[PDB]
Each structure stands twice: as structure tokens, then as C-alpha cells.
Design a protein around this ligand. Structure first.
Ligand SMILES: *[C@@H]1O[C@H](CO)[C@@H](O[C@@H]2O[C@H](CO)[C@@H](O)[C@H](O)[C@H]2NC(C)=O)[C@H](O)[C@H]1NC(C)=O
Ligand SMILES: *[C@@H]1O[C@H](CO)[C@@H](O[C@@H]2O[C@H](CO)[C@@H](O)[C@H](O)[C@H]2NC(C)=O)[C@H](O)[C@H]1NC(C)=O
Ligand SMILES: CCCCCCCC/C=C/CCCCCCCC(=O)OC[C@H](O)CO
Ligand SMILES: CCCCCCCC/C=C/CCCCCCCC(=O)OC[C@H](O)CO
Ligand SMILES: CCCCCCCC/C=C/CCCCCCCC(=O)OC[C@H](O)CO
Ligand SMILES: CCCCCCCC/C=C\CCCCCCCC(=O)OC[C@H](O)CO
Ligand SMILES: CCCCCCCC/C=C\CCCCCCCC(=O)OC[C@H](O)CO
Ligand SMILES: CCCCCCCC/C=C\CCCCCCCC(=O)OC[C@H](O)CO
Ligand SMILES: CCCCCCCC/C=C\CCCCCCCC(=O)OC[C@H](O)CO
Ligand SMILES: *C/C=C(C)/C=C/C=C(C)/C=C/C1=C(C)CCCC1(C)C
Ligand SMILES: *C/C=C(C)/C=C/C=C(C)/C=C/C1=C(C)CCCC1(C)C
Ligand SMILES: *C(=O)CCCCCCCCCCCCCCC
Ligand SMILES: *[C@@H]1O[C@H](CO)[C@@H](O)[C@H](O)[C@H]1NC(C)=O
Ligand SMILES: *[C@@H]1O[C@H](CO)[C@@H](O)[C@H](O)[C@H]1NC(C)=O
Ligand SMILES: CCCCCCCCCCCC(=O)O
Lengths: 303, 304
């Protein structure tokens, strides 16, 4: 093993010289210079200060205007609430942690940071499943109304909780990653007490591979068979934007899971882990650019 | 003296324990925690990421619409330009300085950080002098056209340079302040080789007190003596109020230090006014959007 395993952490840095200290106890300056932890905090402050208003505005505009009740409108309203949970539930801990260079809040802070980002990202993924089914129904007509949209919204939360909640209560766990200033699923240690390996296989299959299979089946039908054109185009971009956001993190996590103990440093997971946190801001941006109706309503309300 | 004087710095920290090091050589962690320096860097990062777009958009809209050629439009276009100089010329040094906790660029970065913020602040202050005179001529009718607006624009740069430039070339000097991650004028040392004392008086009289006298003279003439003009007059009042909120605490603390050199103050004493004043690069286009119906709709047209 080329890293240091503690009771509830795995530092990607050898302790042969004795300088490794727990990410729940002391700043992690032995593995990165202070100016690197500061860049993480500046990045996290930007996401909070952009993520809070753009998601709140999306929530407010949709609630005020009764014309915005299509399945897309409900799903984007759902993402806005989910994004707001990421910003205030998780990103506030990310910022405070990155300011001090360790999880001052201890494992409670790690649970907060990991759970809300895992929950929010899984809400996004299962929402794309809902939109792919809705597009496949509307376009290929083998109707999808408000009741089916609200049922999909509730469905995303149940599926997201089925992924995010178990690591809080003893099936796997949230553990610091990279420079130890963000948290994720434990791909690093076997840790039979929480049965880590069975959860990782459960997460990639049920919560990463099955949703993609559904999405690309519906897209397979759409391809291989003008208001609706606009919605379909935006969902195409939502799928692409999701894949850019999460594939680097998913790929590196799976590499670590299959190469536990191998030689990797703190930067290896840090960059994908913090890049994935743009997940809380990007979906409303696509909304404004690619929905004429919502953009007009937002300019109406804001002006 | 309760601080430490070096050849080109004044650290508001006692070296009676030997820990003080030059802010051009080593991180200043001995006077503040690293998380404190991280907050300055995150603060400056937000200012850069908001400052560039909202000022570039203000520039782009004004140029793209020939209808925006009133004196107010010219003065706000001039401010957007000066703000961009602040963001790219000075704020980039501030962010890099804050990330490492000291002026890695040495005194040259300090010159960049202080000069562009002093220039942008003085362009704004003299812009309000030009706006107050314009409102006085327009409303009191004692005609202010495009020629006078453009002449006012050049006048603001001349007066701002007369304030920002001398510290670059031997009259006073730019010097780190607070936690040593931004720079201002030397109110800390006599340093008579640069004739510091004479400059501080000149800066506060010609470039502080005189502009305020003109502004409040023109305002008083307005008070103790149609709808389109009322909108502009209202925004000019808020611009002046915003300037005082942004810059009065810094000037007051700076003048207290000038009159109490070597007195018992710490790094936090100037840090907060110094970095709060760096909002000067952002707020003016925000008032413009909120308080000019014509410009706001021109921007929505451009943006959509
Ligand atoms: C990294 O190695 C050092 C050195 O072995 C560990 O520090 C020692 O921990 C033991 C047990 O608490 C103490 O008895 C020693 O006094 C410590 N030595 C020093 C020099 O502090 C350290 O705990 C290790 N880090 C991790 C995360 O395991
Ligand atoms: C603050 O005091 C310390 C301690 O006297 C100074 O450090 C000494 O500086 C001299 C001259 O630069 C060196 O010859 C010594 O080797 C230094 N001693 C130590 C222990 O480092 C330091 O220069 C002072 N700081 C300032 C800004 O004047
Ligand atoms: C694990 C628990 C899962 C949930 C269990 C719920 C209770 C059982 C459901 C019965 C279906 C009864 C109604 C079936 C209606 C099907 C047709 C339909 O929904 O049509 C809508 C219509 O098109 C207008 O939008
Ligand atoms: C902690 C985990 C929680 C997980 C569970 C989350 C469930 C979210 C669903 C809420 C539906 C609320 C009711 C919304 C009703 C809207 C009605 C509407 O707008 O349309 C009415 C129309 O008549 C229709 O046909
Ligand atoms: C459709 C749009 C897609 C857009 C997104 C494209 C993403 C491309 C990269 C994926 C990450 C793959 C991770 C693979 C990790 C292997 C790392 C490795 O082998 O590194 C060994 C080394 O020892 C370690 O330090
Ligand atoms: C803890 C769990 C939190 C769950 C949060 C999820 C909510 C998104 C969907 C909520 C349902 C939205 C329905 C539409 C709405 O809000 O209003 C409808 C109508 O306009 C009113 O008059
Ligand atoms: C819907 C959300 C369901 C969440 C279920 C978690 C079960 C975790 C069981 C952990 C048992 C540890 C012994
Ligand atoms: C060093 C550099 C200092 C630049 C100072 C100039 C400010 C903008 C003045 C522009 C006034 C005229 C604008 C005309 C315009 O934009 O379009 C005209 C058609
Ligand atoms: C919205 C927030 C408004 C508060 C603005 C507060 C502005 C405070 C400026 C800094 C100041 O007054 O500081 C003086 C003190 O001597 C050194 O901290
Ligand atoms: C900084 C916060 C981080 C890195 C949160 C991590 C969250 C996960 C472990 C999420 C897992 C996945 C998704 C939400 C979508 C893509 C597929 C998964 C299972 C890798
Ligand atoms: C962080 C950057 C700083 C602190 C820049 C400092 C700028 C000045 C020294 C500005 C001076 C003044 C104005 C521009 C307006 C108010 C009067 C002065 C002289 C205090
Ligand atoms: C309503 O009357 C008009 C409202 C116009 C709002 C446009 C303001 C946009 C300012 C730029 C924001 C940049 C933030 C993102 C930086 C990465
Ligand atoms: C540690 O790194 C070395 C060098 O890459 C590698 O040979 C070894 O397999 C790694 N350890 C584990 C447990 O993978
Ligand atoms: C230093 O601080 C003490 C305590 O207030 C004060 O008496 C002394 O005059 C100060 N020195 C200078 C040079 O102001
Ligand atoms: C402008 C887009 C930049 C794209 C950044 C991709 C982030 C993931 C990089 C993965 C590198 C690593 O394994 O550490």
C-alpha cells in the first residue's frame, strides 16, 4: 500500500517519513502547499455565490408562473431545489474545510459534504432518466402529463436516497478524497465492517450503468425510428453536460476501486472531485440558453 | 514604534520576538492564520469573476447602441474601462498575492496593485465631479453636450494620473498594508527621500477635499433652487452615496495612521477597509442597471 489508512480515512501519501496526520485533526499542508488549498476555497466560494442565486431564481420564476408546468419545467424545478441542498447542505462545509485545509467539523462534516453532493448528482441522473422516458413517449408515441412528471420527481428522490443514504448508516461510508477537502464513497479500503465492496458494485450498476442504459435506449429509439424539438434538443445537452461533469470522477473512482493501495497522489482525485461540483450550477444555465419560454419568463420576473 | 519598519515596508506587527519578515520575501503567516489569507483570495476571485463580465458588458452595450450618447452614458463607459484596468491590471496581482500570503512579484506587484486601484478610484471620484457639474448646468440652467462629456472623460484621466502616477516615480510610494496583501500610499513612514508627507497632504486636498467641495456645492445649488432628467439626477445621488460608503472608511483609517504613525494597530485595522474599497471596480454598473431604464433595456436587447 502506497498510502496511509486510518480508522476512517485513506490519505494518498506515504507515511514513511512520519509526517502524515489525520484529515479530521490537522491541516494537510504536508501533501499540498497552502496556496493550493486556497484555490479550492476560492473555487468553492464562486460556486456558492453563483449557485445560490441562479437556482433560487429558477425556483422562484417557475413557482410564480403557472404556464411553466410541463414535465421539463417540473424536472428543472426539482434540480433547482436539489442544487440548493448541495450548495447549503454540502458546499458550505466544502468551503470551510478548504479554508482550514482539513475537516474541522470532523466526520460529521465529511458526511455532510459527501451525502448532499452524492444526493444532488443522483437526483440529476435519475431526472435525466425521467426526461428520456418522457421524450421517448412524446416523440415515438408507442400521454406523459403533469401527474407523470410529479411522480417522476418523487421517483428521483427515492432513487437518490437509495444511493446516498446507506453510507450514512453503515453500508459503505463517506471518506475524504484527494487533498482531503471533499468526501465521497470509499473506493480505497475493503473495510468489511461496512461491506464496502458490495456497495461500490451496487452504486455503479444500479445508480450509474442502469440509468445510462435506459437513457441510451430511449435515445436509440429517437434516432433509429417545433416546440417539442426545443425540449428534445435541451435534454440532449443535459445528458452531454452530465457526462462531462461526472465521467472523469466516475472513471477515476472505478480505477481506484480496482487498484486499491496503488501509487497515486492527492491531485489524482482532487481535480475530478471538485470539477464534479459544478453539477449544482450548470443545469439552470442550459435552461436559460435553450428554453425560450423560461428565458422570457425569467426576464419578465427579473425586470 | 509598535510595528516594524523595513526599507520599503511597514509591517503593523512588533518584531520584539523576531518573527517579522519582509512582505516581499516570505509568507506573512506570523501575523494571521492561513485561512484568513484564503478568505482574501476567495474574495478577490469573486470580484474578478464578477468585475470583468459586468464591466465588459457595460462597455459592449454602450458601443453597440448609438442611442447611448448622453453625458451619463459616456461617464459610465469611462468607468467600465477604468474598472477593467482595475480588474486585470491590479486585481490579478491581489489574487496571486493573497494566494501565497505575500507579494511574490516583489515591489513591482505592489506598484501594480496600488497604482491601478488608486487610478480607478480617482477616475471614479473625478467622474462624479464631472457629473455634478453636468447636473448643475442641466437642472439649474445657469448646454452640456457630447463635447463637454468627452472633455470630462479626458479630464478625469488627467487628474487621476496626477494622483496615481507620482508614487511610481519618486513622490511618495506604494507600500503593503494590513496583512500585507494589497498596497496603498505610504502613510506609515516619513521616508523623506520620497517626500512622503507632502504627497499625502496633496492627495487629500487636491484629490479628496476639493472634489467633494465641488460635488456638494453643485448638489446644494440643486436643492435650494423633466422625468428623464429626474432619473439621471437620482442615480447621480446614489453614485455619490455609494462612493462615500466605499471610500470614506479607507480614507479615514489612512488619515488616522498618517497622524498617528507608529501607533498601536494590527494587521486587521487596514485590511478590512482596504479590501472593502476594492468593490469600487464592480458597483457602478450595478447602480446603472438598477437606475437607468434606457440602459437596462438596451442591455436586455443585447443579451437576448
Ligand atoms: C505517521 O507516522 C508517525 C510516526 O510513526 C505517527 O506518529 C506516531 O504515532 C504514535 C501513536 O500515536 C506515537 O506514539 C508516536 O509518538 C508518534 N510519533 C510522532 C513523531 O509523532 C503518525 O501517527 C502516523 N500517521 C498516521 C496517519 O498513521
Ligand atoms: C526581526 O528580528 C529578527 C531577529 O533579530 C531578524 O532576523 C535577523 O536578521 C538579521 C539581519 O537580517 C540576520 O543577520 C539574523 O540572522 C536574523 N536572525 C534570525 C534568528 O533570523 C529580522 O531580520 C527582523 N525582521 C525585520 C523585518 O527587520
Ligand atoms: C411500491 C409502490 C408503488 C406505487 C403503488 C401505487 C398503488 C398501486 C397502483 C395501482 C395503479 C392504479 C392506477 C393506474 C393508472 C394507469 C394509467 C394512468 O396513469 O393513466 C394516466 C392518464 O393517462 C392521465 O395522465
Ligand atoms: C425526504 C425525501 C422526500 C421524497 C418525496 C418527495 C415527493 C415530492 C412530491 C411532491 C408533490 C407535491 C404536490 C404537487 C401538486 C401540484 C399540482 C399541480 O400543479 O397540478 C395540479 C393538476 O391538477 C394535476 O393534474
Ligand atoms: C461524451 C463526453 C465525454 C466527456 C468526458 C471524457 C472523460 C475522459 C476521461 C475519463 C477519465 C478516465 C480515468 C482513467 C484513470 C486511469 C488513470 C491511470 O491509469 O493512472 C495511473 C496512475 O498511477 C495514477 O496516478
Ligand atoms: C425534504 C424533501 C424535499 C423535496 C423537494 C422537491 C420538490 C420538487 C417538486 C415539488 C412539487 C412542485 C409542484 C409545483 C409547485 O411547487 O407549485 C404548483 C402550483 O403552482 C402551486 O400553486
Ligand atoms: C429509501 C432510503 C433507504 C435507505 C436504506 C438503508 C439501509 C442501510 C442498512 C445498513 C445496515 C448496517 C448494519
Ligand atoms: C489608455 C486608454 C484610455 C481610454 C479612455 C477612453 C474611454 C472611452 C471613451 C470613448 C468615447 C467615445 C466612444 C465612441 C464609441 O464607442 O463608438 C462611437 C461610434
Ligand atoms: C452589506 C454589508 C455592509 C457592511 C459594510 C461594512 C464596511 C466596513 C468597512 C471597514 C471598516 O470600517 O473597518 C474599520 C476598522 O478600523 C477596520 O476593520
Ligand atoms: C465533491 C463531492 C463529490 C466528489 C461527490 C461524490 C458523489 C458520488 C460518489 C456520486 C456518484 C455518481 C453520480 C451521482 C453520477 C455518476 C455515477 C456515480 C455513481 C459515480
Ligand atoms: C487594495 C487597494 C487599495 C487600498 C487602493 C488604494 C487607493 C487609494 C489610496 C485611493 C485614494 C483615494 C481615493 C481614490 C478616493 C478617496 C480619497 C483617497 C485619497 C483616499
Ligand atoms: C432586468 O430588468 C434586466 C436584468 C439583466 C441581468 C443581467 C446581469 C448579468 C451580469 C453578469 C453576471 C456574470 C456572473 C457569472 C460569472 C462567471
Ligand atoms: C504501490 O506502488 C507500486 C509502484 O507503482 C506498485 O508496484 C504497487 O503494486 C503499489 N501497491 C499496491 C498495493 O498496489
Ligand atoms: C506604541 O503603543 C503604545 C501603547 O498605546 C503607545 O503608548 C506608544 O506611544 C506607541 N508608539 C508610537 C510610536 O505611537
Ligand atoms: C475546460 C474543461 C477542463 C476539463 C477538466 C477535466 C477534469 C478531469 C481531469 C482528470 C484528471 C485526473 O485524473 O486527475
Amino acid at each position: 500500500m502506497n498510502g496511509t489508512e486510518g480508522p476512517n480515512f485513506y490519505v494518498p501519501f506515504s507515511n514513511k517519513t512520519g509526517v502524515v496526520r489525520s484529515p479530521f485533526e490537522a491541516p494537510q499542508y504536508y501533501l499540498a502547499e497552502p496556496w493550493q488549498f486556497s484555490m479550492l476555497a476560492a473555487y468553492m466560494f464562486l460556486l456558492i455565490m453563483l449557485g445560490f442565486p441562479i437556482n433560487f431564481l429558477t425556483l422562484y420564476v417557475t413557482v410564480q408562473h403557472k404556464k411553466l408546468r410541463t414535465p421539463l419545467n417540473y424536472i428543472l424545478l426539482n434540480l433547482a431545489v436539489a442544487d440548493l441542498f448541495m450548495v447549503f447542505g454540502g458546499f458550505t462545509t466544502t468551503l470551510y474545510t478548504s479554508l482550514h485545509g482539513y475537516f474541522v467539523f470532523g466526520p460529521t462534516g465529511c458526511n455532510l459534504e459527501g451525502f448532499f453532493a452524492t444526493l444532488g448528482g443522483e437526483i440529476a441522473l435519475w431526472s435525466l432518466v425521467v426526461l428520456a422516458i418522457e421524450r421517448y413517449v412524446v416523440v415515438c408515441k408507442p400521454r406523459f402529463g403533469e401527474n407523470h412528471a410529479i411522480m417522476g420527481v418523487a421517483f428521483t428522490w427515492v432513487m437518490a436516497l437509495a444511493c446516498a443514504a446507506p453510507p450514512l448508516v453503515g453500508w459503505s461510508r463517506y471518506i475524504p478524497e484527494g487533498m482531503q477537502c471533499s468526501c465521497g464513497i470509499d473506493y480505497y479500503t475493503p473495510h468489511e465492517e461496512t461491506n464496502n465492496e458490495s456497495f461500490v458494485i451496487y452504486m455503479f450498476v444500479v445508480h450509474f450503468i442502469i440509468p445510462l442504459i435506459v437513457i441510451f435506449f430511449c435515445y436509440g429509439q429517437l434516432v433509429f425510428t417545433k416546440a417539442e424539438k426545443e425540449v428534445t434538443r435541451m435534454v440532449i445537452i443535459m445528458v452531454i453536460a452530465f457526462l462531462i461533469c461526472w465521467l472523469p470522477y466516475a472513471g477515476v473512482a472505478f480505477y481506484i476501486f480496482t487498484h486499491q493501495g496503488s501509487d497515486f497522489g492527492p491531485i489524482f482525485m482532487t481535480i475530478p472531485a471538485f470539477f464534479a461540483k459544478t453539477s449544482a450550477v450548470y443545469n439552470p444555465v442550459i435552461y436559460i440558453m435553450m428554453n425560450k419560454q423560461f428565458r422570457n419568463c425569467m426576464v419578465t420576473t427579473l425586470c
